[PDB]
Amino acid sequence: SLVLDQFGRNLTQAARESKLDPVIGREKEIERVMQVLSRRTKNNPVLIGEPGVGKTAVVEGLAQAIVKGEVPETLKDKHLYTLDLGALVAGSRYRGDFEERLKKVLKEIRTRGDIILFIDALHTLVGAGAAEGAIDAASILKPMLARGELQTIGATTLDEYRKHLEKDAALERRFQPIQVAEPSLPHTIEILKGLRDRYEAHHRVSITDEALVQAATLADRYISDRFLPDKAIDLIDEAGSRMRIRRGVAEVDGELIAEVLATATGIPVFKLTEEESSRLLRMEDELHKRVIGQVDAVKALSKAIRRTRAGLKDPKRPGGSFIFAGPSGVGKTELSKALAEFLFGDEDALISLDMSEFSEKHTVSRLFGSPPGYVGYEEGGQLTEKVRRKPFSVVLFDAVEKAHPDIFNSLLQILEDGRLTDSQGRVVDFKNTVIIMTTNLGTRDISKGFNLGFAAQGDTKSNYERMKNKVSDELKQHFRPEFLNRVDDVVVFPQLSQADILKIVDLMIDKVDERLKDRDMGIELSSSAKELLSKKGYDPVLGARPLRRTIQREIEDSLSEKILFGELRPGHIVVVDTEGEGETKTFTFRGEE
Amino acid sequence: SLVLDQFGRNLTQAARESKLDPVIGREKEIERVMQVLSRRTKNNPVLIGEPGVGKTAVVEGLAQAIVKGEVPETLKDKHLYTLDLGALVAGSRYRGDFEERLKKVLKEIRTRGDIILFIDALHTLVGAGAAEGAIDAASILKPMLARGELQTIGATTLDEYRKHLEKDAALERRFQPIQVAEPSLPHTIEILKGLRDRYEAHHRVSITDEALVQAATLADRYISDRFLPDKAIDLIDEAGSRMRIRRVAEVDGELIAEVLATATGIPVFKLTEEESSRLLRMEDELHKRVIGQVDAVKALSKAIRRTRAGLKDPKRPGGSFIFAGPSGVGKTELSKALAEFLFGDEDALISLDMSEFSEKHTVSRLFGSPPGYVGYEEGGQLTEKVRRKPFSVVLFDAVEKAHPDIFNSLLQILEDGRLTDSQGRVVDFKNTVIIMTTNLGTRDISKGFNLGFAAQGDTKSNYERMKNKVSDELKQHFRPEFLNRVDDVVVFPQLSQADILKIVDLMIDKVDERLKDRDMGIELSSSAKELLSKKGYDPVLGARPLRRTIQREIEDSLSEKILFGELRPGHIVVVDTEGEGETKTFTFRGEE
Ligand SMILES: Nc1ncnc2c1ncn2[C@@H]1O[C@H](COP(=O)(O)OP(=O)(O)OP(=O)(O)O)[C@@H](O)[C@H]1O
Ligand SMILES: Nc1ncnc2c1ncn2[C@@H]1O[C@H](COP(=O)(O)OP(=O)(O)OP(=O)(O)O)[C@@H](O)[C@H]1O
Ligand SMILES: Nc1ncnc2c1ncn2[C@@H]1O[C@H](COP(=O)(O)OP(=O)(O)O)[C@@H](O)[C@H]1O
Ligand SMILES: Nc1ncnc2c1ncn2[C@@H]1O[C@H](COP(=O)(O)OP(=O)(O)O)[C@@H](O)[C@H]1O
Ligand SMILES: [Mg+2]
């Protein structure tokens, strides 16, 4: 076994002292392993599973069973060697030397006879035909496997196995797949409890069950790039290392696990703990902080989302469905961005789609995709692709009233069944998404008093009272009552206020100041300048959106030339004062030390 | 230990003898790696970064912390050595001779039990089997690596690590990645303050703190191929060497700037009074070539001054501009003038055509070959070109004819200036000028005189209405999360009359250069220029037909006269108009 020792590791004597692992809850797969191994022919098991799943745990459990336990005939005292293809290429200046030692080791097995082999992730000795320079030593074992002289067990991943191993007929014929899936939360709890003994033996730690539960929950929630039964081990080992490095027996709690996860990635503690009810209450000010002034809108949205987050509804419909009725330049997009930022921590967690160009018939195809064999099949629909990229996001529908009704049908199954099927055949889930439909229906009379012809002065307070009823009736008459029944809430955006414009301009000015402080520049605005920018930068058919260009045209353009001229030196504060009256008012800059 | 000394080096004794550079501002990295090594599983830490950032520096910091005694138990105080692969490979004529030495070394290090090994470029030790003639000696280390009786620390880059260590699962269960990052400006300044004593002693020179900070800043902002701790130290060494080779020697800001000016060429100047002064009248310089569009160049100048004075956000590049004019009226020439003005030459505007970047897989080769792609060497072109010439202009022609997903990459271009291509290594676009030229801004205006008798005309609302049309068309045709993240959309209308005369002057100057190549010259009267302007004016076709008109009416006659022999070297041709009305013709007189 010298060649085996050079390019592999034996398992039977290692498990004879049993210094590998205590197997937890993997009896059925191991029994199936013996079942497949006992076959006269086709006795080449392969375990398909993700890297997080403990497929090697099954193999070492088999080794432990062979060492001690119930083992049927033709399987007792079978020496099991794991082979690493990354080591077999040792000293391979040219390709032939690889196969020479390959034949030497295989004749070593044939002389040995009582050998069971375990392979690595596979599809590197047989799937090497798609690479340049890699060793394609595939048919090396085919005659010996066909003659039944050698028995081996492999392991792969399901998708890659289907995309390589299902191609060649000989490989798929002489290999029996065995499915290993991700263990659930309780199973990981018993696994952690079983490994806690060895972890406390190695790391001088005292581990509590609540700490293990918190570790598993945090690993499942805040980590998704890895699979379940490894990240808990990583967290507990890192916590043990961090406590031992700090070190007249110490203990670990859930606080240490949360701190470890935060240090790995994420904000320190806080959100990693359980504060949901208090998390919702502090949300109210946060929304009223991001958008300056909605009162009823934010209140209704908050009440709806607090209601829906208290778990009562089954996971068959999305978290929330809202219809934002209001004119442009009010802040519906800003409110949606703020809600997404609070709920998921990312600004880009919003998916914005405009329905003004979805009016005709066939355009709706690009919202789903195309049938196979036609243009635009490689890329799916915008909605389906963007949703399947980010399962936790907020869907936004701009100008819904202009969209063609057919998509509403799919919207129906979005709002009732909570899932959709794309043209590629996959399934996209909308359970964790919140759907918002922005609309401007009924705001034309509110925004513009004159509609077409001879109008009187009228009033402006009745709409201020019954805007919600007006928009509800307008949506009921314009659209199908069933769809309005499916949707959950309606939120109406009233007109802006001058003081709100003052807060907006204050935010823009101090955003400028916090970055211009690098040169130690202070910016001061007079109240006259505030009102002048408010009047110039506001427009009823545009709202507060022209302000971003207005201040840039007014302040930044003059500031740039004033700085570049040299009249202003680092370490000064500029105060803005308006010179003139009415349209002749001009912003002027006064420098102070 | 003869085996260690013959084929490896000692850092603990060297740290005890104090023969290496001091370590400053790397406490977090060393704490992280030394707590990683204490893990029960995956206890073999591997450092992932780029060369010259301080991998050896943090390793020496670990060795120093070990030798000084400010370390805890659980390896307490022991020996950390490094393996020199050059000594191992040398003296091994055959593979059997090579492997028998490695196994002996590993057996000794395992038997002593108080030795921790360090290697550099770990990718070679584990991934040499994909190429012929390279020894992949991982089998020497793999068994006892998996057995947990051998501990090693590795240094590797992110490309090699991603392509070698993430692929194999077996080692991925044993190596823990730790990221090491390039230090900030204060940390680099502290490193230079640490190394100044040694470099002054060796070079017999003196260096000022102002020189240190200026060198760090210029290395940060004017060099992209290298890294801050890797480039500033080398540039300081080169400046000291120049000062010593010139002849107490002292170096100032002028020397520490001129050394880079000589090294990288293209003597771009620092923030100077002349540089700011020329920007206040640069519109006139841009009008020396571009004629007939003052509002567009004024907007461009406003944007450039805003982003140059230090008023625009640092998150954006030097500028993002969308040109959506018709054909043959602007663009291209404007970009050339801007490049010549800004980056002191015409070699800028590396330029790309988007129309051939239409298929999805084409988008692949513009930004790096994916793993498994046949011919992996076929990486990105834009990334490499920008990397090699960071101070150039990027100009994409016909952005309409392009695959949509390429426009995704542009989001990382403007939002961050960072592309971090997989095998393209560092892709930093820093402060560059990005110009997207498209032909979707073409409407019917000159023909448009409205249905009706009418009697009126306005030339003011043109820019605002064209801006509205172009903005609406772009918003309808394309997503807004990229349209909002752009500096400006510079749109200009068709060239107007009374601008043709300057264009005629420029083209006549070019023709005059062509004649002067053969020792000749050309000059025209105002009547000839106005006749050419009248004959070659096309409202919608732009200034292109003017060149054809000159070609038909001017140098065809010149060519036939030269061939006939009437015109000879050392002559000047005078062009006049003869006749009246539409019957005016050109007359050529050759004089000495
Ligand atoms: N109430 C508000 N709170 C914060 N910002 C606002 C508000 N109203 C307008 N803005 C500003 O206006 C710009 C975007 O316009 P806004 O958020 O009003 O659009 P919207 O009304 O949601 O859009 P739509 O035109 O689709 O109705 C941003 O600069 C944003 O800061
Ligand atoms: N305003 C101008 N000033 C100077 N030259 C001009 C001007 N307008 C057009 N030209 C000349 O017209 C020719 C074509 O100009 P240019 O290459 O800039 O056009 P373009 O609009 O970018 O091209 P395309 O036809 O691909 O849209 C050049 O010879 C250029 O010098
Ligand atoms: N049923 C189980 N009982 C005990 N430990 C387990 C079990 N399943 C997984 N593990 C542990 O999870 C860890 C990671 O699984 P591993 O076998 O490395 O997966 P893979 O083989 O895909 O890399 C192993 O070290 C193992 O100890
Ligand atoms: N953070 C740092 N602390 C101490 N020295 C540093 C640091 N960063 C860079 N250096 C110095 O830069 C020089 C080159 O760095 P180098 O060791 O080649 O980096 P790497 O190990 O990443 O290749 C070294 O001599 C080192 O002294
Ligand atoms: Mg052009």
Side-chain angles (χ1 to χ4, degrees), chain A residues 177-328:
Chain A
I178 293 178
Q179 287 70 241
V180 289
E182 161 178 329
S184 69
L185 278 162
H187 195 184
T188 64
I189 304 293
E190 290 90 7
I191 286 175
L192 287 157
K193 293 194 291 290
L195 303 181
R196 183 180 65 190
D197 193 11
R198 286 206 177 188
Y199 292 165
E200 294 189 17
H202 177 257
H203 299 297
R204 283 321 300 127
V205 176
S206 175
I207 305 164
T208 62
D209 293 330
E210 57 90 21
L212 297 176
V213 171
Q214 188 82 305
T217 309
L218 291 188
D220 267 324
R221 183 63 181 171
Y222 293 84
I223 314 183
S224 303
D225 49 306
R226 293 180 181 177
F227 284 101
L228 183 39
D230 69 359
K231 24 193 175 181
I233 296 170
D234 308 344
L235 288 175
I236 192 166
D237 206 2
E238 211 283 333
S241 169
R242 187 196 307 250
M243 61 79 71
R244 72 155 60 253
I245 196 165
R246 298 291 185 269
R247 255 176 168 178
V249 176
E251 310 86 6
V252 63
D253 54 354
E255 190 276 331
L256 189 42
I257 301 294
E259 186 268 317
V260 160
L261 175 59
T263 303
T265 182
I267 64 170
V269 68
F270 187 62
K271 195 68 67 179
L272 277 72
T273 59
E274 193 275 331
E275 73 276 11
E276 278 288 272
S277 288
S278 49
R279 180 178 181 266
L280 301 195
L281 271 295
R282 68 204 42 170
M283 182 278 288
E284 183 68 28
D285 293 331
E286 288 178 38
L287 285 183
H288 285 286
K289 151 150 64 69
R290 268 296 293 264
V291 59
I292 296 97
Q294 276 300 318
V295 192
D296 181 275
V298 178
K299 281 312 290 177
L301 192 149
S302 295
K303 298 288 95 176
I305 62 180
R306 280 75 177 272
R307 164 193 305 154
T308 193
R309 294 329 281 260
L312 188 59
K313 68 163 193 68
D314 64 325
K316 293 291 179 67
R317 31 157 300 186
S321 60
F322 309 96
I323 300 183
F324 290 1
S328 176

Side-chain angles (χ1 to χ4, degrees), chain A residues 509 513 516 520-530 533 554-555 558-559 562 567-568 571-579 586-593:
Chain A
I509 299 299
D513 204 346
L516 196 58
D520 185 35
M521 294 298 102
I523 294 94
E524 208 281 335
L525 272 294
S526 56
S527 63
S528 60
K530 298 289 187 68
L533 275 171
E554 283 303 317
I555 301 297
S558 302
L559 272 187
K562 291 199 82 50
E567 62 88 24
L568 191 50
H572 295 84
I573 295 185
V574 289
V575 172
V576 169
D577 58 284
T578 68
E579 290 300 327
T586 289
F587 300 91
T588 45
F589 292 164
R590 186 195 77 261
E592 296 174 349
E593 183 67 28

Side-chain angles (χ1 to χ4, degrees), chain A residues 290-294 326-335 398 438 440 493 496 500 504 507-508 542-546 548:
Chain A
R290 268 296 293 264
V291 59
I292 296 97
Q294 276 300 318
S328 176
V330 179
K332 294 179 284 187
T333 305
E334 192 73 57
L335 170 62
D398 284 327
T438 67
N440 291 40
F493 280 65
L496 268 297
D500 302 329
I504 295 299
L507 267 176
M508 294 182 286
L542 279 194
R545 70 182 66 251
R548 188 58 258 186

Side-chain angles (χ1 to χ4, degrees), chain B residues 341-503:
Chain B
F341 166 67
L342 194 57
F343 305 101
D345 64 358
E346 186 61 28
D347 203 304
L349 61 83
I350 62 170
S351 172
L352 277 298
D353 192 73
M354 295 298 102
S355 294
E356 67 261 15
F357 303 152
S358 65
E359 317 101 308
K360 183 179 175 182
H361 69 71
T362 314
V363 160
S364 190
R365 66 184 183 273
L366 194 53
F367 286 118
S369 195
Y373 200 98
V374 186
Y376 186 77
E377 73 278 343
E378 205 273 324
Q381 310 83 59
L382 174 69
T383 69
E384 198 261 1
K385 286 183 171 66
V386 165
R387 184 177 179 179
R388 311 310 275 189
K389 280 73 176 175
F391 290 98
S392 295
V393 183
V394 179
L395 188 153
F396 294 164
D397 298 88
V399 299
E400 178 68 28
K401 276 78 70 177
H403 210 60
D405 63 358
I406 204 76
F407 276 7
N408 219 354
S409 68
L410 277 296
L411 272 296
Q412 292 113 315
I413 281 290
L414 315 169
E415 189 71 26
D416 294 330
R418 186 57 217 171
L419 293 198
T420 179
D421 190 41
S422 65
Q423 70 276 17
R425 321 306 296 120
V426 173
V427 192
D428 200 334
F429 268 63
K430 53 155 189 64
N431 48 0
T432 53
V433 178
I434 319 299
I435 307 176
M436 296 299 102
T437 81
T438 182
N439 296 115
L440 53 85
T442 71
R443 270 73 173 171
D444 291 331
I445 301 98
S446 179
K447 184 266 183 181
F449 62 90
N450 296 115
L451 182 62
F453 293 97
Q456 206 265 331
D458 213 7
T459 81
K460 169 59 214 70
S461 70
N462 63 7
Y463 204 105
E464 58 90 21
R465 68 173 180 261
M466 294 298 102
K467 279 297 290 300
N468 290 318
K469 298 294 187 291
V470 169
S471 59
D472 284 331
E473 204 280 336
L474 270 168
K475 195 66 66 179
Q476 283 142 4
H477 174 280
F478 190 56
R479 63 186 179 179
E481 63 263 20
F482 171 79
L483 292 182
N484 63 7
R485 295 282 83 82
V486 72
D487 284 328
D488 209 302
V489 178
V490 183
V491 175
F492 41 82
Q494 315 170 16
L495 299 168
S496 178
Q497 192 61 255
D499 314 322
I500 314 295
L501 279 172
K502 276 75 68 178
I503 301 299

